[PDB]
Design a protein around this ligand. Sequence first.
Ligand code: PH1
Ligand code: PH1
Ligand code: PH1
Ligand code: PH1
Ligand code: PH1
Ligand code: PH1
Ligand code: PH1
Ligand code: PH1
Ligand code: PH1
Ligand code: PH1
Ligand code: PH1
Ligand code: PH1
Ligand code: RET
Ligand code: RET
Ligand code: RET
Lengths: 228, 228, 228
Amino acid sequence: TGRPEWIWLALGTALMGLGTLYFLVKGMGVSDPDAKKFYAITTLVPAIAFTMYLSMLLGYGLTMVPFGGEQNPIYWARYADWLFTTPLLLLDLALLVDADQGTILALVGADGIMIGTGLVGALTKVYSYRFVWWAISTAAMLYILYVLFFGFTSKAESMRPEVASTFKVLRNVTVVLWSAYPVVWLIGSEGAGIVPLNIETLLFMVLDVSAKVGFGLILLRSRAIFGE
Amino acid sequence: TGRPEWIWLALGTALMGLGTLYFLVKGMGVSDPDAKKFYAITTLVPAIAFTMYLSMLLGYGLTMVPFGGEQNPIYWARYADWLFTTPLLLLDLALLVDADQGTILALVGADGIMIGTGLVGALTKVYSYRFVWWAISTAAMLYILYVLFFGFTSKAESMRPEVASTFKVLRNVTVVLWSAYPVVWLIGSEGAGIVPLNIETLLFMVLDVSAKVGFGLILLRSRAIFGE
Amino acid sequence: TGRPEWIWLALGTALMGLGTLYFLVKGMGVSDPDAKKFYAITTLVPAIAFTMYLSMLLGYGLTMVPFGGEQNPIYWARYADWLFTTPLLLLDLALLVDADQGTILALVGADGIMIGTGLVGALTKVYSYRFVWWAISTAAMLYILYVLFFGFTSKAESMRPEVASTFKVLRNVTVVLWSAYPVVWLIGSEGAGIVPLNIETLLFMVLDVSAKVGFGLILLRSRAIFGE
Ligand SMILES: CC(C)CCC[C@H](C)CCC[C@H](C)CCC[C@@H](C)CCO[C@H](C)COCC[C@@H](C)CCC[C@@H](C)CCC[C@@H](C)CCCC(C)C
Ligand SMILES: CC(C)CCC[C@H](C)CCC[C@H](C)CCC[C@@H](C)CCO[C@H](C)COCC[C@@H](C)CCC[C@@H](C)CCC[C@@H](C)CCCC(C)C
Ligand SMILES: CC(C)CCC[C@H](C)CCC[C@H](C)CCC[C@@H](C)CCO[C@H](C)COCC[C@@H](C)CCC[C@@H](C)CCC[C@@H](C)CCCC(C)C
Ligand SMILES: CC(C)CCC[C@H](C)CCC[C@H](C)CCC[C@H](C)CCOC[C@@H](C)OCC[C@@H](C)CCC[C@@H](C)CCC[C@@H](C)CCCC(C)C
Ligand SMILES: CC(C)CCC[C@H](C)CCC[C@H](C)CCC[C@H](C)CCOC[C@@H](C)OCC[C@@H](C)CCC[C@@H](C)CCC[C@@H](C)CCCC(C)C
Ligand SMILES: CC(C)CCC[C@H](C)CCC[C@H](C)CCC[C@H](C)CCOC[C@@H](C)OCC[C@@H](C)CCC[C@@H](C)CCC[C@@H](C)CCCC(C)C
Ligand SMILES: CC(C)CCC[C@H](C)CCC[C@H](C)CCC[C@H](C)CCOC[C@@H](C)OCC[C@@H](C)CCC[C@@H](C)CCC[C@@H](C)CCCC(C)C
Ligand SMILES: CC(C)CCC[C@H](C)CCC[C@H](C)CCC[C@H](C)CCOC[C@@H](C)OCC[C@@H](C)CCC[C@@H](C)CCC[C@@H](C)CCCC(C)C
Ligand SMILES: CC(C)CCC[C@H](C)CCC[C@H](C)CCC[C@H](C)CCOC[C@@H](C)OCC[C@@H](C)CCC[C@@H](C)CCC[C@@H](C)CCCC(C)C
Ligand SMILES: CC(C)CCC[C@H](C)CCC[C@H](C)CCC[C@H](C)CCOC[C@H](C)OCC[C@@H](C)CCC[C@@H](C)CCC[C@@H](C)CCCC(C)C
Ligand SMILES: CC(C)CCC[C@H](C)CCC[C@H](C)CCC[C@H](C)CCOC[C@H](C)OCC[C@@H](C)CCC[C@@H](C)CCC[C@@H](C)CCCC(C)C
Ligand SMILES: CC(C)CCC[C@H](C)CCC[C@H](C)CCC[C@H](C)CCOC[C@H](C)OCC[C@@H](C)CCC[C@@H](C)CCC[C@@H](C)CCCC(C)C
Ligand SMILES: *C/C=C(C)/C=C/C=C(C)/C=C/C1=C(C)CCCC1(C)C
Ligand SMILES: *C/C=C(C)/C=C/C=C(C)/C=C/C1=C(C)CCCC1(C)C
Ligand SMILES: *C/C=C(C)/C=C/C=C(C)/C=C/C1=C(C)CCCC1(C)C
């Protein structure tokens, strides 16, 4: 339940808060329109994560879900976080490669399904069913990764070389980090429970900070965010 | 409760899933920007419906609401579905006639009110009050239908004849199908309960598949989605 | 609990409904694209508020929250209202000064955090924690007010003098009214409880009608909404 993992929740809260402040201050020295958008998007991501990590730390974002004949602690606040932060991260990537509206909607929509079905799975009372939702959510994730490689990368090359290289790195970072989430879910408290909640929380914290703060540091330090 | 109607929920799940896959594959042979948008929007609709129909089939999207001195089974997942799919359908229509941002916001906003108030009515514990919400939701629906005829049709004519004819058909399809929803709600388990949940579920399934898959088939088979 | 304050909820419901109808009818005599957007945005605000005020009046938007060792009545419907109406009001201001996408996203995002954290605070079971959320929400509000003065006003001056003057008035109206909300929350039933729910409801009603209907009357009566 909500106790051993408190340290990872506290560290997550602190790291997201610090990241938000760093991006906020760093963005003060920016007036370029396009550069503005990237800062706005990128700063909102850890700001949201900060509030949800704090909600979990304080116990608000935690609930008990019956399944497997047991009362299992489930941090639902994560999904509220991801619901808004994952599409924002996708928007950063899309804006970078100047994706068309159609592809953006496809990505945001698939992302919404990914998080929504993940939440349904996390709160499902029938054990076996939890994995059905996991599969559907994973399929949505694969769709997103597909678009990022066969509907994005190809266009990034048709853009400025500075944009292409920054997109390629952020793209690779996204694919590696995002793909780890379903694995942690599958092995953790929400899934088969091979890994305890304490360790599951630690894993998500490392992934979240990297996917948000790490991702943001790479993007906001790049010249790709400016139109030159 | 959740049993007799299982067959309609299973059929709905299957039909939405098949529709989503068909649109997904069909869209692979498309690269045109504007055509892209229509495929993205139209494929997301049954994809979302698929997840919610499955949630109902598995029992997750079902809840018990006290009213009329009874414990009434209410499938709340429908509203989560409609909250996102109805405005997407409206966006398809709006994009088709190249509606201005102002009208799109008006439609999306009215739609949000329609579904939101429908949900409030569906979960209201005071019988007579349920119909007050039904009336407000219906008023919002009438607003939407009004705009589609006196704020859309008139412009579709000012566009390409291919767009005008496809819009006219989809418009007519929308008006006929959407108008049936409040009637089913009024006579079904959420309303006066003249029709049993089993039959109510069947009716919504026929309406949903037609309004989503049927609607999509007409749109995506049209040349109106391309700019020529 | 839900009784003495019924009159303020009924008055709020009536005033929001009347405002919505007035804006609806007033907007009929408009065909200008940009003017359209302002009417669509501005009419949706009181329309949404109307539904939520009615939900509170009927008892649906009310819930009991344990804290301070007591069962405290909390009208959660307010946050559902504000979640959608505050960013819409910000959009009116942003459209007026032709703000760039980056700033709009920053405002909408900060607003989402403001309302979200306010809701978390309103439903928190640990008394002292409620004020932590209040502080975070207030910080988000201050960010919004900052942008409206150092990221908006400066640009409004670079626009038509009619737009600048209307923005300045609406800006001032927004800053004064919005700043009162955290104070009412802090002194009312959601906070330290120095003011009874009855009076708290009255205060929010006066603020809401002014910030929505009053704000709208000023905007929609202005020539600033037209491009000339
Ligand atoms: C420190 C926090 C907690 C509170 C901040 C408010 C106080 C009053 C200080 C204000 C000064 C700022 C930190 C300056 C940075 C932003 C400037 C450059 C924007 C100027 O206008 C432009 C052109 C918009 O366009 C660009 C905006 C971009 C540079 C910043 C993106 C941030 C955005 C997504 C909003 C984040 C919202 C939080 C800050 C809300 C508070 C946090 C919550 C969780 C409580
Ligand atoms: C089969 C499903 C379950 C999983 C699919 C993922 C795997 C890896 C296969 C990938 C291949 C695709 C089916 C190819 C079709 C899309 C191509 C043309 C886009 C290319 O880029 C463009 C230009 C975007 O712009 C256009 C997109 C448009 C052609 C498709 C619209 C679909 C969109 C709304 C997203 C739907 C999301 C689901 C697919 C998510 C999974 C379902 C959930 C419920 C679990
Ligand atoms: C009176 C209400 C309850 C129901 C109204 C429906 C019936 C059928 C009457 C229709 C006539 C309207 C009142 C005319 C005004 C709108 C016209 C000018 C738009 C034309 O097209 C343009 C160019 C869009 O673009 C502009 C729209 C703008 C002039 C109006 C903005 C309103 C918008 C935000 C939607 C509000 C939604 C409510 C009306 C929904 C009902 C309320 C709920 C809470 C139940
Ligand atoms: C987006 C924007 C807002 C960014 C700015 C964030 C911020 C202001 C700067 C960054 C600094 C971090 C968040 C570091 C603080 C996190 C803590 C060390 C967490 C552990 O505390 C708890 C341990 C030691 O356990 C002790 C025992 C318990 C039961 C006591 C309860 C303590 C609790 C209420 C502290 C939370 C307050 C933090 C998160 C900051 C508030 C933000 C303000 C703006 C209001
Ligand atoms: C491009 C654009 C169009 C966007 C794309 C679509 C979008 C972004 C993604 C697609 C949407 C998701 C895949 C749908 C998942 C949503 C969940 C099933 C809703 C969770 O309900 C909640 C859980 C906790 O349920 C709890 C169960 C019980 C025990 C609680 C009882 C209370 C209940 C009756 C109230 C529910 C009110 C909600 C569901 C109404 C609408 C939900 C919205 C979040 C949509
Ligand atoms: C958007 C995108 C994802 C589209 C792709 C969808 C899909 C993969 C292709 C389309 C095919 C359909 C969905 C047909 C399957 C539906 C079933 C026949 C429903 C009835 O099963 C139940 C009956 C016979 O009752 C039996 C007794 C019960 C208690 C057993 C529980 C069975 C249940 C868990 C099956 C649901 C799984 C389906 C919906 C498919 C999963 C999708 C994957 C991607 C994970
Ligand atoms: C253009 C743009 C601006 C968009 C236009 C606006 C938009 C799209 C449409 C307008 C919005 C709707 C008409 C509002 C309806 C929302 C519902 C009243 C909220 C349902 O709450 C839920 C039900 C199930 O309530 C359950 C009651 C109890 C028993 C549950 C107790 C838990 C409770 C305290 C938590 C509620 C948390 C929510 C309501 C916070 C915000 C809600 C959001 C969905 C907005
Ligand atoms: C956006 C759009 C929709 C705007 C249009 C709104 C509207 C149609 C016009 C504006 C007029 C106002 C809303 C005035 C009505 C409000 C009432 C006086 C509130 C008090 O009633 C209650 C007192 C006296 O207590 C009596 C005892 C109780 C227990 C009886 C229950 C009465 C309750 C069900 C009335 C609510 C219905 C109102 C809000 C209008 C419905 C809108 C329709 C479109 C369906
Ligand atoms: C620019 C763009 C990207 C947008 C910017 C971001 C956005 C607009 C603002 C930022 C988001 C907020 C600050 C986050 C606050 C949301 C709340 C913490 C969620 C409330 O949950 C609800 C309360 C009542 O909780 C109730 C607690 C228990 C007792 C209920 C048990 C049921 C529970 C398990 C179901 C919860 C389902 C939800 C939370 C899933 C997602 C939530 C969405 C609303 C995001
Ligand atoms: C760790 C990271 C998230 C930063 C955390 C910062 C923290 C929250 C505080 C933020 C504010 C500070 C003052 C730092 C800002 C100052 C500098 C400009 C940072 C320099 O890095 C500047 C650069 C360019 O940026 C890139 C730095 C790299 C490390 C980002 C890569 C992200 C990701 C792909 C790393 C992989 C995941 C990790 C945790 C390893 C897991 C190992 C497994 C085998 C288990
Ligand atoms: C029934 C429909 C939803 C399709 C269901 C498909 C299903 C989910 C599987 C999807 C994938 C398949 C392989 C089909 C795709 C292949 C073709 C291109 C289809 C050809 O139709 C191609 C065409 C052009 O399209 C138009 C076809 C018509 C039938 C659509 C009209 C929708 C609507 C207005 C019908 C009315 C409602 C019905 C159910 C009748 C109710 C009667 C009342 C009196 C009760
Ligand atoms: C009170 C207001 C919200 C209007 C309520 C209207 C009501 C809901 C019905 C709507 C439909 C009606 C038929 C009115 C429309 C007709 C006219 C065009 C109105 C003329 O005002 C036209 C003009 C130009 O507009 C501006 C009028 C001013 C009064 C708006 C200023 C808003 C705000 C900043 C006022 C401060 C708050 C108040 C309540 C004082 C609190 C005092 C404290 C010390 C406690
Ligand atoms: C800041 C957070 C980030 C970048 C979060 C990413 C989350 C995902 C890619 C989550 C995916 C999931 C699945 C594929 C299946 C099971 C459910 C989820 C939600 C864990
Ligand atoms: C895929 C789903 C579609 C096209 C759904 C459409 C739903 C409506 C037009 C629903 C309308 C309702 C009312 C007018 C009043 C009562 C409540 C509703 C939600 C059934
Ligand atoms: C129609 C409603 C309007 C304009 C509402 C505005 C609301 C705010 C500015 C609310 C702010 C809050 C805080 C700053 C802190 C405590 C929580 C809130 C939600 C009361």
